Design a binder for this molecule. Structure first.
Ligand code: MG
Lengths: 82, 59, 85, 79, 140, 156, 148, 120
């Protein structure tokens, strides 16, 4: 009845040693969300910057523009990965 | 896993509203929990520039 | 956490001696063993000169005590062979 | 004004413990001083005769014809 | 002038190709660009130490966060994984924390199990059987 | 030796009772048998290995790339078995060694793609008022490995 | 420095190790003066080493041009259409051999800064961390202070 | 004035309590020391800097073998605050010419003359 963590939320962790005691086997299949745990699907510059601040829960400063020196330093073709 | 690129990215960096009842609590010990969740330091995806803080509602 | 590793006779730093740093990192896919790592060759040279030093100092200590025992025995023979005539 | 924490005391103390065990292992030599005398005089003398010998064997290097003539190759061309 | 210097556009331009992205007159006036360019190269080499340092604290932040999700703290996780002879490092544990959270959950289970065997072993003192995950593999 | 239940009577942490080693070693035998059946019948999908190549641990799947900061002195195209794998994970199980896994258990292959140099990398020293200014430019050798396959074997 | 230079991610050209390995170096173009002191080591490279080199990898086509140059060059062209022009000016044969093998061993990608030392295209297997991994669900999907 | 410090001899006389503490025998003592520098010679007098150079301890955390003779012990007594000393114990013999290459000094203080990298 011992569980080293409450195997409830992410995966059911079942640790093991082998007979040699050299490898630790972990066995951890995923915990599916139960059907009972779900809800059915339901069916001007100043005021515009205040309105965006209040909408996205940020301060006002990132809505003011920036000058050309900063707009042209920006890398428009940045490296992608993955 | 097996999401598309855009909803995986939305899912990871989405921010979570937490509730935190401050009755009979000390304010600094509330402030520590609140501060960790406001910076996003409770996420393993954390980074300073990646802007992954959450909302803390203290009642 | 290396004080634990000192309790178990391991190196205090897991990058010390033992199987993580002294087995070869790679092989050929055929199963031909790789040429040895540079740091492992260096390290085996260090261990060998260390072992040579242990043997050398041990032998100078032992030869030292044996020569001293000859000097003491020959002093006593020079005692007993001059108490005569 | 600077004050002494628990880190500083515990650090100081573990250095004192290493020191005390150094005191222990220096308390039982394998030989007396009479026994050790000249037990390594030969190896010390040979070592210094090697130092002395490398000191007194210092001289200009050999000069070769092949090097001096090999400078002529700077105008080697094709035909 | 017997021999005055012909090839001086290129000495200047050796410095100023490094300054083209500064602000102000540092990007054009050699006298200013030299002090800033030198100073940029010194920062550029002292920043190798800080790159290594800041990666490591970044990993400790991510391992700390991910292990607090499973109730552990960071010293408990790292200590009791060393004690299982699982010598994974901080970079790999942070990357498992983000990309393989079941492996990370099972590592947190292995570290808290080892932590409890440490408790129970150092409580019932004397000659007893050792813990199962507490055993070590001797190498000779 | 009774103490009545106060705040500081007991320690604040709840007591855990670890299971007895008879039923626990039997339980481990059940688990290892399960996972060994998953490795036999090929239940797993793609694997990731943590491999101690060179001086550091690379977390690695198949079909990817590792950039190593030294010349390995192999030809481009040569396959390589990376020993020193110390974690192997699938979706539903992992296997972690103390500290390394068995060579009979896991096999990680990798080819050499390219052997480059690094970008030029500046080393400048400067002390003020001392006329102390050195500059060096260093490029380290590098090789790129392509991890081809992580094959796993039923040896538990 | 890194903020002055461009950077990129670690890549291959067409997944260069997956199926088979392809030598990324198409053409070399040596140009070597006949009479000229700077292309001496180039001359001794064409005479000694370039035929052995040309046989050790036949996917590379090598052009030795041999005009009156004042600085000799080698011009490596790569399958992805990159061109690396390097000089073999006043180099020994051994230095030219190590340079040509260096150009052979590498690919056409730039030797600018590489951002990460690795490139998975499938970094996660158990599913990447989102904030609802490692959280338990509730009965009937309720949230805090939800009545029914 | 800061001077060189003599240390009295009562400091270097073990008690049976200490033989119970560390693992030593006063009869049949050990032949070889392992000495390691664990502290810097910076901010130390020049004589201690010299003794560290003589004993071959310029690099820290690197073990060095010495003889347990009173001369070497005299030099060690001068710098005993910078070093660590343990007895070189040898579980198997000293290494023969067959086992000369395949040795390893372990952390315990022992020098093993067969160093495989297999588990027992
Ligand atoms: Mg550090």
């Amino acid at each position: 009845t011992y569980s080293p963590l409450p195997d409830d939320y992410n995966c059911n962790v079942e640790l093991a040693l082998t007979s040699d005691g050299r490898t630790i086997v972990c066995y951890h299949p995923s915990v599916d969300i139960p059907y009972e745990h779900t809800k059915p699907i339901p069916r001007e510059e100043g005021p515009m910057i205040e309105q965006l601040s209040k909408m996205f829960f940020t301060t006002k400063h990132r809505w003011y523009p920036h000058g050309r020196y900063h707009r042209c330093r920006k890398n428009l073709n940045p490296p992608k990965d993955r | 896993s097996s999401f598309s690129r855009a909803p995986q990215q939305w899912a990871t960096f989405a921010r979570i509203w937490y509730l935190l009842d401050g009755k009979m609590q000390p304010p600094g010990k509330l402030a520590a929990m609140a501060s960790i969740r406001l910076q996003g330091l409770h996420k393993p995806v954390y980074h300073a520039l990646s802007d992954c803080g959450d909302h803390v509602v203290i009642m | 956490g290396g004080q634990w590793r000192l309790q178990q006779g391991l190196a205090a730093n897991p990058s010390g001696y033992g199987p993580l740093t002294e087995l070869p990192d790679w092989s050929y896919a055929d199963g031909r063993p790789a040429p040895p790592m540079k740091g492992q060759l260096r390290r085996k040279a260090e261990r060998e000169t260390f072992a040579r030093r242990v043997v050398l100092l041990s032998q100078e200590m032992d030869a030292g005590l044996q020569a001293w025992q000859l000097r003491q025995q020959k002093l006593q023979e020079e005692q007993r062979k001059q108490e005569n005539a | 004004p600077r004050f002494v924490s628990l880190r500083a005391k515990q650090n100081m103390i573990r250095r004192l413990e290493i020191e005390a065990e150094n005191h222990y292992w220096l308390s039982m030599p394998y030989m007396t001083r009479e026994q050790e005398r000249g037990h390594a005089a030969v190896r010390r003398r040979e070592a210094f005769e090697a130092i002395k010998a490398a000191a007194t064997s210092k001289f200009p290097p050999h000069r070769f014809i092949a090097d001096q003539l090999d400078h002529l190759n700077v105008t080697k061309k094709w035909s | 002038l017997r021999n005055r210097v012909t090839d001086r556009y290129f000495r200047i331009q050796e410095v100023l190709k490094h300054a083209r992205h500064f602000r102000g007159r540092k990007n054009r006036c050699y006298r200013l660009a030299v002090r800033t360019v030198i100073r940029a190269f010194v920062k550029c080499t002292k920043a190798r130490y800080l790159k290594k340092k800041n990666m490591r604290t970044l990993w400790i932040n991510r391992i700390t966060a991910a292990s607090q999700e499973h109730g552990l703290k960071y010293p408990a996780l790292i200590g009791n994984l060393v004690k299982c002879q699982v010598e994974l490092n901080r970079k790999v544990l942070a990357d498992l924390a983000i990309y393989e959270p079941k492996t990370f959950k099972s590592l947190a289970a292995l570290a808290s199990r080892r932590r409890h065997e440490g408790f129970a072993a150092a409580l019932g003192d004397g000659k007893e059987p050792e813990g199962i995950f507490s055993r070590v593999v001797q190498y000779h | 030796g009774y103490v009545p239940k106060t705040s500081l009577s007991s320690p604040p942490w709840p007591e855990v009772v670890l299971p007895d080693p008879v039923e626990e070693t039997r339980h481990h035998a059940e688990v290892v048998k399960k996972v060994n059946e998953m490795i036999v019948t090929g239940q797993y999908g793609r694997l990731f290995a943590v491999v101690h190549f060179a001086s550091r641990q690379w977390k690695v799947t198949s079909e990817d790339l590792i950039l190593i900061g030294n010349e390995l002195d192999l030809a481009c195209g040569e396959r390589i078995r990376l020993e020193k794998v110390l974690l192997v994970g699938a979706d539903n199980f992992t296997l972690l060694g103390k500290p390394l896994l068995g060579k009979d258990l896991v096999r990680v292959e990798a080819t050499v793609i390219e052997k480059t140099e690094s970008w030029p990398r500046i080393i400048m020293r400067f002390r003020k008022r001392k006329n102390f200014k050195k500059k060096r430019i260093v490029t380290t050798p590098q090789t790129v490995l392509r991890i081809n396959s992580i094959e796993i074997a039923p040896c538990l | 420095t890194a903020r002055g230079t461009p950077s990129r991610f670690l890549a291959s050209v067409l997944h260069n190790g997956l199926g088979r390995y392809v030598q990324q170096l198409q053409r070399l173009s040596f140009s070597v003066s006949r009479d000229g002191a700077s292309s001496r080591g180039a001359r001794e490279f064409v005479e000694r080493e370039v035929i052995d080199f040309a046989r050790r990898n036949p996917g590379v086509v090598i052009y030795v041009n041999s005009r009156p140059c004042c600085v000799p060059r080698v011009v490596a062209e790569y399958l992805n259409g990159a061109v690396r022009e390097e000089s073999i000016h006043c180099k020994s044969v051994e230095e030219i051999s190590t340079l040509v093998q260096k150009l052979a061993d590498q690919s056409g990608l730039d030797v600018i800064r590489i951002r990460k030392p690795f490139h998975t295209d499938n970094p996660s297997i158990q599913g990447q961390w989102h904030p609802f991994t490692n959280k338990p669900t509730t009965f009937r999907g309720l949230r805090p202070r939800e009545v029914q | 004035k800061f001077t060189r410090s003599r240390i009295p001899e009562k400091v270097f006389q073990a008690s049976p309590e200490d033989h119970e503490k560390y693992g030593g025998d006063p009869q049949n003592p050990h032949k070889l020391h392992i000495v390691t520098r664990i502290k810097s010679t910076r901010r130390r007098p020049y004589w201690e800097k010299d003794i560290i150079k003589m004993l071959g301890l310029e690099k820290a955390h690197t073990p060095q073998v010495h003889k347990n003779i009173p001369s070497v012990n005299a030099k060690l007594k001068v710098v005993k605050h910078l070093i660590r000393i343990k007895p070189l114990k040898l579980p198997q013999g000293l290494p023969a010419e067959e086992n000369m290459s395949n040795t390893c000094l372990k952390s315990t203080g022992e020098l093993v003359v067969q160093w495989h990298l297999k588990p027992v």
